RNA sequence: CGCCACUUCAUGGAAAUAAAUCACUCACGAAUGUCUU
């Protein structure tokens, strides 16, 4: 397999800088690093030294010497684009 | 429920690498091989 397909569900309304752009969604350059060093994390075993080791066994790593980004490419959309705004604050008001 | 903001604004890597460096053609052709006293 060369393409995997996820979808997501919402549980809470995040909290987004560029909501100006009605396809402003989570961003995957937020989600890729994270999701790195959770692979990672999980290969070694809780360990994110073995699990790079593994990814540098595997060539799974775009770099073996500095960094422990993955050679996978990430992409997050929208397929219906109405959303809902909230006004998150500190203080009760009418 | 009231009141109230601060902080952060680029670093590390790559900075040219290989292929072709002259090729083909012409490399002398024609006249004179003695002439006039």
Known sequence: MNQLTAILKQ??????????????????????????KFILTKLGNGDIREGRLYAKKNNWLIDNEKNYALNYKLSISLQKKSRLEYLITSSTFP
Request: aromatic residues 4%; hydrophobic residues 35%; without cysteine.
């Open 11 to 36: 549980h809470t309304p995040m909290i987004h800088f560029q909501h100006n752009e009605s396809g402003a969604t989570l961003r995957a350059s937020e989600v890729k690093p994270l999701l790195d």
